[PDB]
Amino acid sequence: MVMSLLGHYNNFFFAAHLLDIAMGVKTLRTILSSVTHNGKQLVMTVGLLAVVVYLYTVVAFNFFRKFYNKSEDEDEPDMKCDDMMTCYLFHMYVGVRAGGGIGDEIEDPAGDEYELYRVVFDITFFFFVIVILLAIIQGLIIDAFG
Amino acid sequence: CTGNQQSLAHSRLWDAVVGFLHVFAHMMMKLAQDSSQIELLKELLDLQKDMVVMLLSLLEGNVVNGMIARQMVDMLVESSSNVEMILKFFDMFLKLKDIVGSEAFQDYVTDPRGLISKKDFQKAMDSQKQFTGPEIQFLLSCSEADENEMINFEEFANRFQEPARDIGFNVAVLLTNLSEHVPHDPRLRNFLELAESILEYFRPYLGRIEIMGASRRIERIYFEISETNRAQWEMPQVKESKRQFIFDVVNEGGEAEKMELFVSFCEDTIFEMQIAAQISEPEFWGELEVQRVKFLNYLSRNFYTLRFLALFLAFAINFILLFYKVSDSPPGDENMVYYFLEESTGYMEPALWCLSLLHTLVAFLCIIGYNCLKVPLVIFKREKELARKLEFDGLYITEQPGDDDVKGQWDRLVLNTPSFPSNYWDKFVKRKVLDKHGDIFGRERIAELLGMDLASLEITAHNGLLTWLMSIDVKYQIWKFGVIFTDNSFLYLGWYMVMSLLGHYNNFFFAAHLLDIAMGVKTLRTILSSVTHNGKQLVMTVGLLAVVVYLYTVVAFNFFRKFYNKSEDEDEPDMKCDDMMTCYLFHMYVGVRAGGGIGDEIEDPAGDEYELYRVVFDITFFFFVIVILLAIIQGLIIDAFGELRDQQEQVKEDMETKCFICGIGSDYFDTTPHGFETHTLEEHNLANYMFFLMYLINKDETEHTGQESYVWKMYQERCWDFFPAGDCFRKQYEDQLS
Amino acid sequence: GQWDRLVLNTPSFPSNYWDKFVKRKVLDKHGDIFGRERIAELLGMDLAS
Amino acid sequence: ELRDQQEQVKEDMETKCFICGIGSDYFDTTPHGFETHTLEEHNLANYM
Ligand SMILES: Nc1ncnc2c1ncn2[C@@H]1O[C@H](COP(=O)(O)OP(=O)(O)OP(=O)(O)O)[C@@H](O)[C@H]1O
Numbered sequence: 001m002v003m004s005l006l007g008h009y010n011n012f013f014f015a016a017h018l019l020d021i022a023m024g025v026k027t028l029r030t031i032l033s034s035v036t037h038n039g040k041q042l043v044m045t046v047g048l049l050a051v052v053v054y055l056y057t058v059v060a061f062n063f064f065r066k067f068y069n070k071s072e073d074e075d076e077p078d079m080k081c082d083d084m085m086t087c088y089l090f091h092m093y094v095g096v097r098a099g100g101g102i103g104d105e106i107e108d109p110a111g112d113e114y115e116l117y118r119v120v121f122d123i124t125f126f127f128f129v130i131v132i133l134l135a136i137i138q139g140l141i142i143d144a145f146g
Numbered sequence: 147c148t149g150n151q152q153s154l155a156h157s158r159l160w161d162a163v164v165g166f167l168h169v170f171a172h173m174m175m176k177l178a179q180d181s182s183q184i185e186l187l188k189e190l191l192d193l194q195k196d197m198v199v200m201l202l203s204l205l206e207g208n209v210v211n212g213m214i215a216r217q218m219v220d221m222l223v224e225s226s227s228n229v230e231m232i233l234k235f236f237d238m239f240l241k242l243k244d245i246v247g248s249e250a251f252q253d254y255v256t257d258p259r260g261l262i263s264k265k266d267f268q269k270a271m272d273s274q275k276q277f278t279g280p281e282i283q284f285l286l287s288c289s290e291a292d293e294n295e296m297i298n299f300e301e302f303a304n305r306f307q308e309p310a311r312d313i314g315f316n317v318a319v320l321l322t323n324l325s326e327h328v329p330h331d332p333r334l335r336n337f338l339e340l341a342e343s344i345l346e347y348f349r350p351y352l353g354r355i356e357i358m359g360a361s362r363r364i365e366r367i368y369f370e371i372s373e374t375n376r377a378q379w380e381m382p383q384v385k386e387s388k389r390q391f392i393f394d395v396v397n398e399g400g401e402a403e404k405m406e407l408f409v410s411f412c413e414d415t416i417f418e419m420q421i422a423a424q425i426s427e428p429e430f431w432g433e434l435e436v437q438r439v440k441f442l443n444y445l446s447r448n449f450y451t452l453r454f455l456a457l458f459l460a461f462a463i464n465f466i467l468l469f470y471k472v473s474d475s476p477p478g479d480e481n482m483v484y485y486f487l488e489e490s491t492g493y494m495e496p497a498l499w500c501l502s503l504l505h506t507l508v509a510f511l512c513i514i515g516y517n518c519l520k521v522p523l524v525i526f527k528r529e530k531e532l533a534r535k536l537e538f539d540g541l542y543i544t545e546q547p548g549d550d551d552v553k554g555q556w557d558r559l560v561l562n563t564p565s566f567p568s569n570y571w572d573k574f575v576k577r578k579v580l581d582k583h584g585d586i587f588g589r590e591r592i593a594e595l596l597g598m599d600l601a602s603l604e605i606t607a608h609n610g611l612l613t614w615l616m617s618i619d620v621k622y623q624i625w626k627f628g629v630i631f632t633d634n635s636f637l638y639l640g641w642y643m644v645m646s647l648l649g650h651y652n653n654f655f656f657a658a659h660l661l662d663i664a665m666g667v668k669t670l671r672t673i674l675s676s677v678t679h680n681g682k683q684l685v686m687t688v689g690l691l692a693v694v695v696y697l698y699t700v701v702a703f704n705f706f707r708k709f710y711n712k713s714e715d716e717d718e719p720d721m722k723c724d725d726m727m728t729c730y731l732f733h734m735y736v737g738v739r740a741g742g743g744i745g746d747e748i749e750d751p752a753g754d755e756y757e758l759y760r761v762v763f764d765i766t767f768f769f770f771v772i773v774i775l776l777a778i779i780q781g782l783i784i785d786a787f788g789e790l791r792d793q794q795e796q797v798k799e800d801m802e803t804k805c806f807i808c809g810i811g812s813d814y815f816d817t818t819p820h821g822f823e824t825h826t827l828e829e830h831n832l833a834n835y836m837f838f839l840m841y842l843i844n845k846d847e848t849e850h851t852g853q854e855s856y857v858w859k860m861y862q863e864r865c866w867d868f869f870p871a872g873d874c875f876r877k878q879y880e881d882q883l884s
Numbered sequence: 885g886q887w888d889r890l891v892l893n894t895p896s897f898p899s900n901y902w903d904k905f906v907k908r909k910v911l912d913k914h915g916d917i918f919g920r921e922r923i924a925e926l927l928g929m930d931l932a933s
Numbered sequence: 934e935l936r937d938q939q940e941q942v943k944e945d946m947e948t949k950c951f952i953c954g955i956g957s958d959y960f961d962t963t964p965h966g967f968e969t970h971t972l973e974e975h976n977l978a979n980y981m
Pocket residue numbers: 385389801802803804805806807811826830831832
């Protein structure tokens with residue numbers, strides 16, 4: 001009722017009533033219940049993912065700072081990792097939505113005296129995050145629903 | 147002894163007991179009205195306790211409908227006129243103790259010394275209709291009450307509680323035994339109803355053990371559970387250890403050895419309570435020593451809170467470290483200074499500097515607390531296992547270690563040491579093994595191996611700047627240090643402290659403590675365990691993937707070299723595959739991180755005389771790697787995690803249909819309401835068995851009952867035939883004689 | 885449990901429950917061992933007078 | 934399922950007798966009862 005009242009102030013507030021009452025049906029009621037079913041595990045797994053990516057951010061900030069360049073206009077630097085907050089935000093935002101981890105977005109390490117270290121960095125980021133932690137979260141949600 | 151039991155049954159003992167009950171019941175009332183002959187009353191109660199002990203002994207091996215039980219119940223119903231007085235004497239003082247200290251009774255006291263001011267004690271006792279006129283008169287008479295009102299309820303209520311506790315417990319045990327053996331007797335129901343006030347009082351103290359009896363039948367055992375033995379059993383650091391023990395026994399314990407593991411757990415938790423006994427708060431050179439001893443107890447008694455404090459410190463340090471910034475110039479070539487981004491307050495840097503120090507201090511305190519708390523447990527377990535291997539299944543005399551386990555070879559060091567059983571209770575294991583194996587094998591060689599003095603020196607028991615610098619067992623200390631360093635928890639704490647120290651060299655080394663201690667929680671602990679659960683399969687699947695990628699690398703190197711070009715700048719070639727190492731690195735690095743295999747990165751083969759071959763190459767690479775091997779690895783990890791989570795629930799749901807001791811749990815005992823709960827909480831309770839073991843250990847050998855001596859003798863020789871088999875005294879007697 | 889303490893000592897506590905004599909039942913059950921006057925004050929019913 | 938079939942055969946013995954049928958619902962009432970019935974009376978190696 002409160003949001004129905006608020007919908008007169010702005011007509012777009014009636015959109016939430018499309019979702020909030022569609023769950024009153026039987027089939028879609030358990031979809032939301034699945035999220036809160038493993039509530040004590042979802043938040044903790046997300047925290048573990050955040051800690052892991054934080055460790056990767058620390059490693060990248062200390063050593064691989066020169067690779068995080070995202071502009072070529074003679075105003076080149078655009079350093080994604082020149083601040084711990086900025087590097088962590090870059091790793092959060094697009095380091096997991098990418099299909100191959102953080103290695104897809106950064107430049108190639110071919111012949112930069114750190115090629116093996118950065119190859120290990122990218123491979124272990126991909127393996128430990130994309131194909132492990134995301135799969136664990138997916139399995140938690142789907143198994144709770146099942 | 148059946149003959150003597152029948153001889154006393156068919157004798158004049160019953161008349162003597164009746165007369166004794168009469169005189170005791172009358173003298174208990176007579177002696178309590180003056181508080182001058184208190185010692186005589188205490189001695190009288192002791193003699194009553196001895197008589198009740200004799201009566202209980204008369205019912206040692208009685209059949210459910212035994213003749214001796216019926217004779218005893220006839221004896222009690224013959225002298226009911228005095229048993230009622232005894233029960234009322236107990237109940238009235240129990241009710242007086244309960245009433246005193248409440249609110250209704252406290253509403254009458256107005257004096258400031260704690261005096262009820264007699265002539266208002268009667269009103270206070272009459273407001274709550276519990277006693278009668280004569281009972282209140284008797285209570286008034288038993289009080290001191292000088293100057294016509296001086297009844298000190300604080301001492302009056304507690305005067306008769308301690309002396310009458312033993313006799314009350316003994317008569318409660320006797321009544322419980324008689325009621326549980328002959329239930330079809332209305333002449334005992336009135337006795338039970340009149341004794342409900344003492345029976346309900348000794349509810350938590352009265353144990354109930356069912357054992358395999360001496361000859362052929364299940365017998366019930368009643369004993370006393372000390373208040374301290376139950377207070378320490380309810381400690382938070384005990385329930386989780388019990389749950390871990392059940393987890394291990396149910397999953398990886400199997401059968402035919404459950405009782406041995408249970409007894410070992412009972413001894414381990416007895417040692418745990420022994421450790422916790424001296425950890426309680428009450429507990430020139432001498433003052434410093436006692437102060438140091440007192441100081442080294444706050445860390446041990448409060449050790450997990452230090453772990454939480456270290457976790458909080460690590461989180462705060464990492465949050466502070468999140469503000470680091472790098473620039474080519476100082477805030478005021480290739481400098482690259484790592485300075486701090488002070489947003490609005492300059493106190494962030496001193497806060498980081500201080501937190502770095504307290505983190506290391508807390509880590510050192512944590513490792514000290516672990517050393518003073520959980521190391522004696524593992525030392526005791528190792529010593530006990532070694533001693534019981536030596537004296538029962540001798541491993542360094544008859545057999546030898548198989549050279550495959552480092553534990554057996556390392557345990558050879560602690561032998562021939564003057565202080566080998568420093569933590570184990572048994573200090574005479576060397577003499578036991580010498581007397582057991584010193585005849586078939588060389589007595590002198592066994593004495594040399596165990597390092598004890600020969601029979602010439604130690605024949606029989608005929609009878610600190612220097613102590614801490616000369617009286618040290620170097621060999622024992624080396625063995626203990628090796629055992630401690632082999633422990634996983636000690637290694638983890640040592641690594642924690644080492645990296646805390648290293649964090650002062652570079653502030654970024656505190657980041658690992660963010661992850662390594664977050665796994666101490668329950669939910670995230672199995673996430674890492676899943677990786678090593680399928681350890682023998684993960685590495686091998688990764689090796690298979692590497693071999694497949696190597697085969698594709700060979701095929702690409704031989705034929706499809708011209709396609710691997712990754713530059714267009716008139717310095718074109720940039721051949722990724724012109725060297726087998728480079729081609730393999732290109733395929734492994736980005737051939738699996740791509741969503742469509744290696745075909746996405748290389749150039750198109752459209753119209754190049756190899757279009758079909760390269761199309762097959764790309765399609766089979768994609769299908770065989772991306773959608774098969776990666777899926778297999780993912781399934782391995784997720785299935786290991788799921789089965790690890792499911793094993794934690796299988797052990798939690800297995801008890802609800804099975805009995806931990808006698809076998810069948812709920813297909814025969816749940817036929818009555820709360821039937822499984824009764825069978826668990828009354829007859830077969832593992833905590834009750836542990837309490838019985840503690841009671842036997844604490845009790846003197848000369849005071850052991852026949853069943854207690856039988857159980858103790860079987861325990862000393864490590865035979866568990868006294869534990870209930872698939873029988874619970876109800877399939878034998880209560881099946882027909884309900 | 886803490887919020888249920890407000891509904892006590894109310895003239896119309898069992899407004900929906902069928903049993904309107906629960907106060908008298910608990911007074912007759914626990915009014916002897918504990919204070920009858922204090923129980924009446926806690927449950928807010930008129931005293932026996 | 935290939936991995937699970939290799940585990941089902943490793944747990945069917947622990948409740949059934951390879952020769953006479955019933956394995957543990959009648960012989961485990963005594964301690965080491967299944968072990969005795971396997972190692973003394975009905976042993977396939979002994980039949981070989
Ligand atoms: N001797 C026993 N025989 C059979 N089952 C038992 C025995 N002792 C305990 N159990 C099982 O354990 C249950 C109670 O013990 P458990 O420790 O599992 O639970 P809890 O008392 O709620 O836990 P806790 O005290 O550890 O917090 C019983 O309901 C029963 O299923």
